[PDB]
Amino acid sequence: GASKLRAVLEKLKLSRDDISTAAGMVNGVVDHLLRRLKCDSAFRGVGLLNTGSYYEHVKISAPNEFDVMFKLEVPRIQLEEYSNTRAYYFVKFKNPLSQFLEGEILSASKMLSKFRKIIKEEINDIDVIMKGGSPAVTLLISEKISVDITLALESKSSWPASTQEGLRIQNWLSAKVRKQLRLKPFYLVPKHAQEETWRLSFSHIEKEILNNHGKSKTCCENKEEKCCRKDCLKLMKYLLEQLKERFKDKKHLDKFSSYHVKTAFFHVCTQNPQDSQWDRKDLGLCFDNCVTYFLQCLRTEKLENYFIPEFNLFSSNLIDKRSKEFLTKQIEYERNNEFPVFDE
DNA sequence: CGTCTTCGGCAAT
DNA sequence: AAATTGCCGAAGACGA
């Protein structure tokens, strides 16, 4: 019901007064931590990269969770793939970060220790409190707003071989745009699989795609070309959020995150490259495409990382089969009854 | 649809 | 020498 879905999206609209107060609190704390980190020899070339739903304009309910990425431009990087995970690597150099070296590989553990320590020493100074390595630190500002701070290495090199067949946007955002996007740097965040591994990150490309998302260059720039891509992502994020809360006493949905929904959404955009396939009048049909695709990923236990096709976010090593069947069962029930979790 | 606010980039310090 | 910063304009809440 497109009429009901529009009512849900109004409920999910952020308060501009809340945005102004929340952004002010986040920026003040983030700018403070950047100034301190820029004073350290190791974090000398640190820079800010705003990531996540808020800066992608797909945050729902309230601006209570922010995601920032503190990126270091590292030089002469040499990646070594860990096992055959296609997404986790060991970092080597072909310098400031010499202190974090353990042998010849860059220690994500050591680098995370100084990162957390410098931030923790600076957070006790401030009405903010600090709480698998990525995000490095989670701040709670005034008991209302949480900010995930992710340490990240910036490599301006060509993307690793595992991403060769990823970012399949040629028939959607154009091969010209895929060439320019893959020219931008890629990022490595400390994530353990072994605690000295780094995981590939493309949150900057995800933000850029979401804010320049149409086949048409003028998509969502005027009233005539308002698509419902972001509305469908919001509805999918809310559906998973309401289900995880409804079944929080059970532990099945604890492994599911909004990134699974966001990754699945990018795949639906590849499957439906035209803006006419995302017309505002067809919000219920477009949302059902996102639901139908997400059910297919659950049932087949296959949800490829949008940038690393061989990395399966729904792998059996990552999520239990009973968790996928449970979420499959609940989504099918929810769809067959006009999504009761939206009313709550 | 005009107004106001925030965010992102990068010449110019 | 290279990190900082002010500013322009899009995105989107908001109302009338």
Ligand SMILES: Nc1ncnc2c1ncn2[C@@H]1O[C@H](COP(=O)(O)OP(=O)(O)OP(=O)(O)O)[C@@H](O)[C@H]1O
């Ligand atoms: N498993 C993952 N693999 C790769 N990148 C991830 C993963 N989880 C999160 N990210 C990156 O971190 C960012 C923030 O993720 P987070 O878990 O905070 O949710 P989100 O995308 O911000 O949406 P919301 O916070 O509203 O649920 C994402 O935009 C994504 O780019």
Ligand SMILES: [Mg+2]
């Ligand atoms: Mg977020």
Ligand SMILES: [Mg+2]
């Ligand atoms: Mg997070």
Ligand SMILES: [Zn+2]
């Ligand atoms: Zn659009």
